[PDB]
Amino acid sequence: TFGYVHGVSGPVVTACDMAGAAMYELVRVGHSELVGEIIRLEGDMATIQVYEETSGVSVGDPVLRTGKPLSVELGPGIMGAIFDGIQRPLSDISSQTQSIYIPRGVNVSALSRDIKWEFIPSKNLRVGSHITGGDIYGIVNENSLIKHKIMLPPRSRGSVTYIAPPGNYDASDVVLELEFEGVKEKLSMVQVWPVRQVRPVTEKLPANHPLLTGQRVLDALFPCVQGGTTAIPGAFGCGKTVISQSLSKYSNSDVIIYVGCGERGNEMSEVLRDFPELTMEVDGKVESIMKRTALVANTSNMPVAAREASIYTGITLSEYFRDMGYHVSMMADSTSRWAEALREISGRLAEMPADSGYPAYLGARLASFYERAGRVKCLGNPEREGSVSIVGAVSPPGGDFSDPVTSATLGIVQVFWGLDKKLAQRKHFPSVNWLISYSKYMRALDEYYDKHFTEFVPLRTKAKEILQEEEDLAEIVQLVGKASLAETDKITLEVAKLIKDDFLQQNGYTPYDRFCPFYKTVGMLSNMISFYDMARRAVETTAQSDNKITWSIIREHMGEILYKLSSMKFKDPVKDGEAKIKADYAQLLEDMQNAFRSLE
Amino acid sequence: QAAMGSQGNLSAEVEQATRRQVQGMQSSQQRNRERVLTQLLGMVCDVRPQVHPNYRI
Amino acid sequence: YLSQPRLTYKTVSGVNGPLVILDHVKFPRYAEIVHLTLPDGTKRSGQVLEVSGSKAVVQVFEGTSGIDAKKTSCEFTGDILRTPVSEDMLGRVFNGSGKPIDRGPVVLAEDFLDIMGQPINPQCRIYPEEMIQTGISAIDGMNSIARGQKIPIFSAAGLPHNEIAAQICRQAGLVKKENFAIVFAAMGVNMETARFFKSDFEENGSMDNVCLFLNLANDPTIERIITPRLALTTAEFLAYQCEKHVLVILTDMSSYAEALREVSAAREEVPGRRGFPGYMYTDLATIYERAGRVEGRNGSITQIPILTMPNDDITHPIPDLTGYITEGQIYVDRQLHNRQIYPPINVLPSLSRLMKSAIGEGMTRKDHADVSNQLYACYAIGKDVQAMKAVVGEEALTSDDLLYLEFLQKFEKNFITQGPYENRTVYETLDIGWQLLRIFPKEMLKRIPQSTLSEFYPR
């Protein structure tokens, strides 16, 4: 049942006497029992990808062959917890080893077996009942936010022979006993699923509901949807991590799985410190955010091979909660660090590289990762509906969107949130380019917007036309010097500035811009567009008369309106609620109309 | 001139403080030297033969 | 401990570049250190970068010139490069191999630590929430330094990045209105640079709290990629075992990257950009991420990994991959230096990721964040106006544009220009900020809410 180490080249270990080993089986390499996964088979020798540092591993060290593939434990005890790249809890390691460093070769259960969970059965099953994969036969109260559904694993079925009455049970007990054909299966609350296999669904459905983001841009102009996939290929300093944190903090998702794959160590500590201090009311009660989030840490200075396991563990966790009827919006803040791991391993493997040193199958890995997103009808008789969204960062070198990872990613994801380093240098955050970005879900959400708002869509269109027209003018204005501009064009240029400075950018570290409720975004946009139309009309109706209302006349006459419009961001939605904000915006519209009547 | 004399005698204090520390160090280790020799010599005399953990058969 | 005698081999199979390949080795261990003696008595060391069966590939630190095939004698230590560390390393000067060069004795270890180190458990890592007062307005105001932050200075050949680092070493304090142990890795530099820092540390009267590691331009290029780890390993001992606050400065990190690139080429590893290894990022993270505070212990490590940007190319892999790992950068340039501005720090392309937590009520002054953001807006716009005026002429500008040129001109001489020994407080820096911001009318200060302008703007 053992092999022996033949050689070590770093993250790749070669072992012998493993004739019966299959690809993508787990192994334990070394006397510390380091976790690895078999990549290649050459005769009776196996090539092992090891997720822990191989320093100190000797030729001749035993290799334990484990039949089970890389897998994740799924059950109660996930929410609020932080895991490493292979599903080992960091709070349990630190509480058991008393160290500040993560030891190598730690064999710790993913989900604690000491906690006595409060379990209630569905009350609809009886002995002799027929249960199928995905069925829920009880719920565990992890906390007040997420109700943890105990599902029958996929590829399992049979007749019920015993169901645990309501009471206190731990993860080592038996909750459900079922039999199929003589063979009997005893299940606890924890199921095991290979992280490289896609959990099966009844039907993949179109995404027809917004994924609310606490941002003005990245929502009004480039919507994301529940179940959709997007990329943020920002250069260093562009603030893509802050966008990811903002989406996690303030969104309409039920569960967030945050994967720090190659991320700075300070970022995961930042989350653990800040998140417990955030609030999200449930039913009149104030609750912490961490009860509905979970996160995986595989930091930049951790084993590079573990970056692949981290990504697959994250999405597998996301699917698990998707199956329970929750909307999941996971985000892996790197992607490039995963592809980088693939390159380093491919090098050690002496494989023939493709574009820029990356493996030829880079696109294959990204395609199969992102396609696990989507709104689905779940397996299981209870007819759940869920989703997994994926918001993945990319780190193109130099900010040049030409590398194989950015290029392949853009061919897969349906929403492109491109960031511009030259906007970040100006602290124009979020640094969204708004010229190269796009969202392919605009048509999907048009029905939603008409149902709840109506006014939003024509405002979105006019805003894009103004910003695009300003860019078309900026190209020539740089050369002309604003000498040949018509008065109708100067209005576009200055209103476009108004939009850029007050609407597209917001300071996510303030009490007023940390979250931007949609009604506020469309409210203040309506005012900005209403100004555009009234100001453009004012000159269009007077240019041929005996006095033309040039920009300098409206600018001096309505300077107070331009200041009020710029102040619309400083509304503090937590202190001043919807009623005051809408009434305030209505007053600005009246002030504009009255000033225009006195002008024209 | 005042500064040079101060530096001179400041150096004398440095030299005098150093001699104090060196003699104190010698006085301390003289109380443990014999115990350390016994512990170290035992570890040398205790051979402890062993076969490499990875030797097969 | 390791009681078994170590084995000595004369079984060298062959030599290929910097790599000496041995055969007939008993149970080779990966990443173990080998000591070898040349036929002429020269002693050298190297590390096993690959094992396979009875073979092992040793990368020799000093070099492979003079390595024989029949008379070369090698012995395997049986462990990884664990290095002796002690508290009294402060005040000592070492070479890039960890040996003393100050005519003192070898290190009398309190323990032996793995030079590769271990990753700090992110659950016990505590997010930095204290600010360091560098005394430089260009930093303390608009790009604050936190204790536990990683902030390199991006520089270019010929710029005074050595003077800025030296200045920071002496006038780095706290804004709580403190003696930092400095570990300085001088690698890939000439004698005059190393002597400059060594002399400055003595001139500052702080040498008893400074540990130096020197690896000069005329020293082996392979030792240049362990010197940072030697510095950081000592820093980790001091910070996390003895609760001493440590400031670690790594000199031109580009000499690290170039030394690594040479190793990457020698080992035929997969290149990424500009010939650097595809794993350059991972290797840099091993160096950079050895920083920050740890919950339950009163120490910290702050890093300033200054680096030279080849050809002032901010997208060069060295500053690029560093920019992805560290919490921003200070960035100096030639446009300021060529005008005799010191320190020549250009705030526009700079940032501090931990700065947002560091500023404000309970840390410095409540208007800190507002002053910084508006100064960035006004400075960047002034630069945009210069780009315009260079073509259209001064006559094409209006009063809204001239104000930004007035700000830009006054900003660089009042805010950035200081001098090697000008030590300003963070509060004085903000006061200066307001003096410059008050150039504009309230309506143009669009990054600051009226709830702040009404209190501070009138003065």
Ligand SMILES: Nc1ncnc2c1ncn2[C@@H]1O[C@H](COP(=O)(O)OP(=O)(O)O)[C@@H](O)[C@H]1O
């Ligand atoms: N949306 C934002 N709102 C406010 N400040 C931001 C925003 N995005 C970025 N920043 C600022 O700029 C810094 C850079 O963002 P960060 O996410 O660290 O960059 P990266 O793109 O490298 O992940 C942040 O630490 C913060 O100070």
Ligand SMILES: [Mg+2]
């Ligand atoms: Mg980031």
